[PDB]
Design an enzyme around this catalytic site. Structure first.
Site, mmCIF file in Angstrom:
data_model
loop_
_atom_site.group_PDB
_atom_site.id
_atom_site.type_symbol
_atom_site.label_atom_id
_atom_site.label_comp_id
_atom_site.label_asym_id
_atom_site.label_seq_id
_atom_site.Cartn_x
_atom_site.Cartn_y
_atom_site.Cartn_z
ATOM 1 N N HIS B 50 0.813 -1.209 0.000
ATOM 2 C CA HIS B 50 0.000 0.000 0.000
ATOM 3 C C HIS B 50 0.853 1.268 0.000
ATOM 4 O O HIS B 50 0.498 2.256 -0.638
ATOM 5 C CB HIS B 50 -0.937 -0.001 1.207
ATOM 6 C CG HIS B 50 -1.781 1.230 1.326
ATOM 7 N ND1 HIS B 50 -1.453 2.279 2.158
ATOM 8 C CD2 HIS B 50 -2.947 1.574 0.730
ATOM 9 C CE1 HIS B 50 -2.376 3.220 2.064
ATOM 10 N NE2 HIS B 50 -3.293 2.817 1.204
ATOM 11 N N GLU B 53 1.977 2.403 -3.370
ATOM 12 C CA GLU B 53 0.968 3.140 -4.121
ATOM 13 C C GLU B 53 1.225 4.640 -4.010
ATOM 14 O O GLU B 53 1.153 5.366 -5.003
ATOM 15 C CB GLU B 53 -0.441 2.800 -3.622
ATOM 16 C CG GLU B 53 -1.537 3.673 -4.216
ATOM 17 C CD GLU B 53 -2.894 3.427 -3.586
ATOM 18 O OE1 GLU B 53 -3.086 2.349 -2.984
ATOM 19 O OE2 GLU B 53 -3.767 4.315 -3.688
ATOM 20 N N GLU B 130 -2.996 8.127 7.772
ATOM 21 C CA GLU B 130 -4.038 7.361 7.094
ATOM 22 C C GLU B 130 -4.439 6.145 7.922
ATOM 23 O O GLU B 130 -5.582 5.691 7.868
ATOM 24 C CB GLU B 130 -3.568 6.930 5.700
ATOM 25 C CG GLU B 130 -4.638 6.251 4.849
ATOM 26 C CD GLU B 130 -4.145 5.897 3.452
ATOM 27 O OE1 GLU B 130 -3.125 6.471 3.011
ATOM 28 O OE2 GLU B 130 -4.778 5.040 2.796
HETATM 29 ZN ZN LIG Z 1 -4.357 4.917 0.707
#
Ligand SMILES: [Zn+2]
Ligand SMILES: [Zn+2]
Ligand SMILES: [Zn+2]
Ligand SMILES: [Zn+2]
Lengths: 413, 416
Positions: B50, B53, B130
């Site tokens: 992730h 990304e 996040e």
């Molecule tokens: Zn994300």
């Protein structure tokens, strides 16, 4: 109570001597390595090295270690737990030299061949296959820690996952060994009728020459268990079993916590001894359980107070849990007699001095505290233990025996 | 009725898939699929797939950090990205006139992405935010994460692609460089182009930008070996969180892997139980009884052993156990075989409408192919519609009784 003298070598190898008094000694080699130092996918290695540590070295054959120690009538064993890997030879003081010579031969001189790695892996695979997969208490043990811990390496038992074992490589094991079996990560403990100054210089003769990997420090595990936020449960249906088992565990502080003393006492009151609450009510009186006991595990990181019970035939595990809880609720109500508090206190005095006799029992004490560097906690144990009141056993009870920190596992046919 | 396609594998193992759409004008979508997800991670080093990304839009050999987005936006394009359990996916929404530049930009990040320390350090703090916001301090997020912790014990599905906080906190630049260079090889990537564009133009343009990209070595990508043991009974977990105020519930049942025959029925079961405004969870929990503010189901079609998931968030003064008692009562009612012919028909007529609606949009078609390409299951994709419309009620009830057993159930409560 017994005095000790310690010295640290130039490589970081800590040597600790505990003089004791009839020529009988025990020489220990401790490694600050456990299954807590593993990673999911490559677990069980800590235990694999236990089998490999007795294999061929530079001057020793594949089974020469166990045969040399047998020659001077000594006994050797080994164990790997969550936090520590421990080797020891119990013999006379006369064989102090060869024993240190042997252990040094397996530390900085041990080579792990392929033709030794392959056969031993399928062996450990069987050890996993028949002591956890097709074993009542073993499966319950493993699945509990699967449930109680989500992130911290206590998520698994030192035996590790089967697929992990199946996918080990010689490189994986060499890396784990070379890193964690460094002199800096080891401790030499000698307990019995031996001279402390004699032990030191004789340890230097076999261990001062051995070197470490690099200069960098040993990688410290960072996977801290998040505080448990409510009850976790798991039921395990497994063919091969006939009786119905249950494990009830409550989250408990780390090793050095002040409340570990009261917990140890709670274990001896609840489910440890022929007169414990579990044995009397569940086994003796109500006869619901064939086996029932408790164990305040004193793990290095966040530990767990464990209840285990395997009920009599045709007895549901929900009844066992309900009755253990019933006992704990009576406990949290403060229902402890002075006589109970007294009997556990006097039995602790008895068990303590009985261990001071044998060098093997004494070395076991220090070993668990040397690796934590909490020797001060060891010496102050009895004084803090005998000064325990019922108020202390109840405060701790209502503190950690909450359902929000509880982890329950049912083992059914 | 499903759009024909043409596939070409390059000399570096990169697969190129062109899905032309004549019934469309100008609009295309340029996809780059990496066969990587959280399932290729290991606990202690999770959430890395992730993180990549975020880092994929940083500096390269020719592009500055964020210059990718600037260029895309300059020709009025749209570029999003997403990482899941099994697949990492990037795509640009634009016209065929920008096909060439889009392929250039993607080649620029595939075999030319440099991962500077001064980019990794600040970005980690972002993905740390996040994590805290959308999982550590989010009802549905925490519930989602804590569920997979419970349902899976050994397989990498033990955690969602966000990973553990301490994992995130203990990442190293070396860790990420290792992960990326290993899993973002051309041999592990797929370039998919859907819309109004010629296939031979797609191929020669992809060959232009990607054929010369090199792999790391000759040895194959490491395949995860940590198979989840068969679930041997019910698993539960209660999560007390301060931030929450309503009680939530997650009830999941273990389910076969991606390429299974029962997946179509499972999809149909989710359509019936907890999807749409006509589902059972909607018009019984939310409407008829007003027990939950939200209630839905999702047949996750994960690559390995998957999960059918029920999620419900109760109204005020309604306990989570009350929600579980009801959804189970529906499943028991379901397992009794109580599905009307009318109900089954509404599922099929809606599936027709959604399918034909998707063939008009290159974005929808791409999303379909993307999931089945990474699994090498295009045959399954083409055979889907016919299999769905040939479903009998009995098929739905068989699949129901097969997998919706408590011994495969995982339940997570969110309190207070
Ligand atoms: Zn994300
Ligand atoms: Zn063993
Ligand atoms: Zn202890
Ligand atoms: Zn799907």
């Amino acid at each position: 109570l017994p005095k000790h003298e310690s010295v640290t070598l130039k490589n970081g190898l800590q040597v600790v001597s505990v003089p004791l008094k009839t020529g009988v000694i025990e020489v220990d080699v401790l490694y600050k390595v456990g299954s807590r130092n593993e990673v999911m996918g490559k677990s069980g290695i800590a235990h694999m090295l236990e089998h490999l540590n007795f294999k061929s070295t530079k001057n020793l054959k594949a089974g020469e270690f166990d045969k040399i120690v047998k020659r001077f009538g000594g006994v050797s064993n080994a164990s790997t737990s969550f936090d520590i890997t421990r080797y020891f030879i119990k013999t006379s003081e006369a064989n102090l030299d060869k024993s240190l010579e042997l252990f040094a031969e397996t530390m900085g001189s041990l080579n792990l061949k392929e033709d030794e790695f392959l056969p031993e892996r399928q062996v450990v695979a069987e050890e996993r296959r028949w002591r956890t997969d097709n074993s009542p208490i073993g499966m319950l043990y493993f699945r509990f820690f699967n449930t109680a811990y989500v992130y911290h390496p206590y998520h698994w038992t030192p035996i590790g996952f089967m697929d992990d074992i199946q996918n080990w490589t010689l490189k994986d094991i060499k890396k784990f060994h070379s890193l964690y079996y460094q002199p800096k990560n080891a401790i030499v403990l000698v307990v019995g009728d031996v001279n402390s100054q004699k032990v030191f210089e004789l340890t230097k003769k076999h261990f001062e020459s051995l070197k470490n990997l690099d200069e960098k420090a040993i990688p410290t595990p960072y996977m801290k268990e998040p505080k448990q936020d409510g009850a976790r449960t798991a039921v395990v249906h497994k063919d091969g079993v006939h009786l119905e088992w249950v494990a009830l565990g409550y989250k408990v502080p780390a090793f050095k916590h002040k409340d570990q003393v009261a917990l140890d006492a709670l274990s001896k009151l609840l489910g440890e001894g022929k007169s414990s609450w579990l044995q009397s009510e569940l086994v003796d009186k109500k006869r619901l359980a064939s086996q029932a006991f408790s164990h305040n595990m004193q793990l290095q990181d966040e530990s767990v107070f464990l209840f285990i019970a395997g009920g009599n035939p045709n007895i549901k595990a929900e009844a066992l849990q309900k009755e253990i809880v019933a006992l704990l609720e009576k406990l949290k109500k403060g229902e402890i007699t002075q006589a109970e508090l007294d009997k556990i206190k006097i039995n602790q005095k008895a068990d303590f001095i009985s261990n001071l006799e044998s060098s093997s029992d004494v070395a076991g004490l220090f070993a668990d505290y040397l690796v934590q560097n909490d020797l001060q906690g060891l010496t102050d144990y009895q004084q803090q233990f005998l000064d325990l009141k019922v108020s202390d056993l109840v405060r701790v009870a209502n503190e950690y025996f909450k359902d929000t920190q509880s982890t329950t596992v049912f083992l059914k046919p």
